[PDB]
Each structure stands twice: as C-alpha cells, then as structure tokens.
Amino acid sequence: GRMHSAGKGISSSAIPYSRNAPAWFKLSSESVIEQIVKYARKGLTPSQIGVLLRDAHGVTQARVITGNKIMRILKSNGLAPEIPEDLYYLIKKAVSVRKHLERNRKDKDAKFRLILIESRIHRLARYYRTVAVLPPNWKYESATASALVN
C-alpha cells in the first residue's frame, strides 16, 4: 500500500502472455545488443535504455527479444555499475534534500522528508548487503554521498 505514505494506488504495467517476439519484429538480437551497448557507452541507465528501446526502436521487451535482461547484458559486456540504480537515485535525493536544508535551515517539512528518505536508503542498503552485491562494510554517510554523486 505504497509505504511511507497512505495511498492504495494500483498503477503499473501489464505483461503480455506471449513469451516470444512479435511477428512484425525484423531486427537481429545481435543488432539490438550492440544498440544497448552503444547506449550504455553513451551513458544512460538501464531503465532509460529500455525506455529508448521501446519508444524509438520498437523493441517490445528486451527480456523477451534477447534471452538476458538489460542489466545482465551490461554486466556480461563489462558495463556493471557500482551501486544499482534505485540505491543511486535514493542517495541522489538524499544529497538533494540535505543541500536544500543547508541553504534553508527552516524547512522542518524537508527535515521530515529527509528522515523518510534515509529510512528507505537504509532498507535498500541492508538488502543489498544481504545479497552481497555491496561490500559488508559499505556505510552511507555525507562524505561518501558527496564524493559518489558529485
């Protein structure tokens, strides 16, 4: 029910029954893999890579047009990030709110929102330390945040 809030919103994407390429798809798996690699070298995130591939190039779903997912293909070709994208964006938002507080020391609402963002960051980092994609000594703090996002 959309935690750290109250709303009961159902708004996501369906996923079709079919597990094969559409009949109008006349592009090679090697070509779209090269496309993904070129977009990663250009410097986009996996989510925006999939967004560009279903908008412009008509790739319906990368997981079904090629056997591997986008982040799996990137890790296969050496384009692995250092921290996953949702933890990256959460830490980015934490830096954002902290700097806004520094410029404006009166925003108690921003203090409360920063508390909630820090809680989400702790939950995600604990899960990633559990799966051990992150080192077990990975601590989040202001200097790590500044030096990693800047």
Binding site: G43, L44, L79, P81, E82, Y88, N150
Partner: peptide, 19 residues
C-alpha cells in the same frame, strides 16, 4: 539524462581525473 557517475568505468576515470 547522461548520468556521468553511474558506471564503474566512469568512476574509474573519475579516480584517474583525481590523479
């Protein structure tokens, strides 16, 4: 939407530019 600090090779070049 070019997140220049996202990837490991990009932060490796960032360490290079610190050096």
């Amino acid at each position: 939407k070019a997140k220049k600090d996202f990837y490991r090779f990009q932060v490796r070049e960032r360490k290079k530019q610190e050096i």
